[PDB]
UniProtKB/Swiss-Prot annotation, chain B:
The keyword NAD does not apply. This is Estrogen receptor. The gene is ESR1. Phosphorylated by cyclin A/CDK2 and CK1. Phosphorylation probably enhances transcriptional activity. Self-association induces phosphorylation. Phosphorylated by LMTK3 in vitro. Glycosylated; contains N-acetylglucosamine, probably O-linked. Changing residue 60 to E: Has higher transcriptional activity in the absence of wild type ER. Inhibits transcriptional activity when coexpressed with the wild type receptor.
Amino acid sequence: LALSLTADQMVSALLDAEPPILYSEYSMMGLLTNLADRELVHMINWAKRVPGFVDLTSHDQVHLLECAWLEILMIGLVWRSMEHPGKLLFAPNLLLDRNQGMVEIFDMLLATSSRFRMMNLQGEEFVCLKSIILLNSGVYTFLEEKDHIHRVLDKITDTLIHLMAKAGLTLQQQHQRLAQLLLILSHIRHMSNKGMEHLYSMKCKNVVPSYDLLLEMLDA
Amino acid sequence: SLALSLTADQMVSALLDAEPPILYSEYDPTRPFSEASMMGLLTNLADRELVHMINWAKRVPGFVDLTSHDQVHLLECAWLEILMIGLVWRSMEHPGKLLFAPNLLLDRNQGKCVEGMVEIFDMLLATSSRFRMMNLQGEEFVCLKSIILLNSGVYTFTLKSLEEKDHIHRVLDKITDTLIHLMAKAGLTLQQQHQRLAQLLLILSHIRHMSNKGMEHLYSMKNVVPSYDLLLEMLDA
Ligand SMILES: O=S(=O)([C@H]1C[C@H]2O[C@@H]1C(c1ccc(O)cc1)=C2c1ccc(O)cc1)N1CCc2ccccc21
Ligand SMILES: O=S(=O)([C@H]1C[C@H]2O[C@@H]1C(c1ccc(O)cc1)=C2c1ccc(O)cc1)N1CCc2ccccc21
């Protein structure tokens, strides 16, 4: 079914699954932990709505989510901050600037947002990229399951190209922009690693959702 | 300043010509290895490979148009990724094993000598199996290795700085064009071309992950990771 979707249907589905922008409830790290915790609940419901994801075993769904959760949070943050040069819009009521920064990661996030601004990243491209993160980040650490995932990934590639072609990009511009978008994903992975190790360095091991947590949330 | 003037065929030929040598490990290490002695062998191999990687980097079209400082920053961010993709390429035809050198072919169970390493060995072996599944070609590999050099550090760099970064993104576009040209000449449909381009670039996120995990281990242990000063000196020599 996922493999029968057109580009317009794929975009429509991902746009409908988009979580809302949440507000901070009001310690910088208290606030961010509580925000992420609330974001995670919406992320599970979002992931179930990504075409092809629920065709996977529950075990494989958890492994993909376990590997991608912080990259997904970060790319959302970068998207929200895109119109606020030099600032990070964690929430509409939590909009931070460097001197409030951790500052090495804070600067990497700002560089990503500047890059999205520079490329005029569009909302329909953003949701395709967040779905690529979900399906790609853990596929190389798991046979028919991994084949299905690559076929779904191929569909999201097709969707990205169709979006660009209808926006009037030439064939050359289409492939160049596809590569530019996917190459930023390597920087998002790097930032998630940096974030993970800093969650560790802070005495915050415990805040990372476990395999069993994600499994139970998926079951719920 | 004519790197952006190369055709696709001239880009591939430059990259193939730039390829570094295959090096050997120690001829007769005591085996079985200990944790300390295996790490010693791997570090010694990586230290010798680094010199040849700087020579290769200097021949990647566009790399020397950058300031020395920006050259080193790219090498600092990419060196382990570059060694790793070379390892995975070497190992493609050896399922279940990692061909560190012609005289150092390690299966999986040997990565267990080192705490934390079998995990990364399993990721490396998965990448080699993915390259095999995709029938990765040598012309594609050298394009990918060059993308890693230019892309991994670009997002962490005045008007000069924006022009350096713009230059990188233009060279990266040229290598994209080259990858597509290779695929179209091979006879792939346009749809297949875009799908394969994506598939190759998505593996680069996995290589970044593996390098991140390995760098963490490196920083945790001597000062094994090459310093800025060392990279600069190798570039100036
Ligand atoms: O540790 S950071 O990397 C933090 C940023 C980011 O990764 C971390 C984190 C997080 C995840 C789960 C938690 O339970 C708590 C925090 C991310 C996030 C991204 C998007 C969101 O929508 C929510 C969260 N870092 C870098 C800059 C910075 C400034 C202040 C404090 C920490 C910090
Ligand atoms: O990433 S590792 O798995 C290991 C394997 C492989 O990457 C590392 C290593 C290496 C590189 C430089 C060194 O100075 C020393 C070792 C490799 C290599 C790859 C390609 C080459 O052409 C040459 C070498 N790693 C890092 C340290 C560590 C501690 C505990 C667990 C795992 C781990």
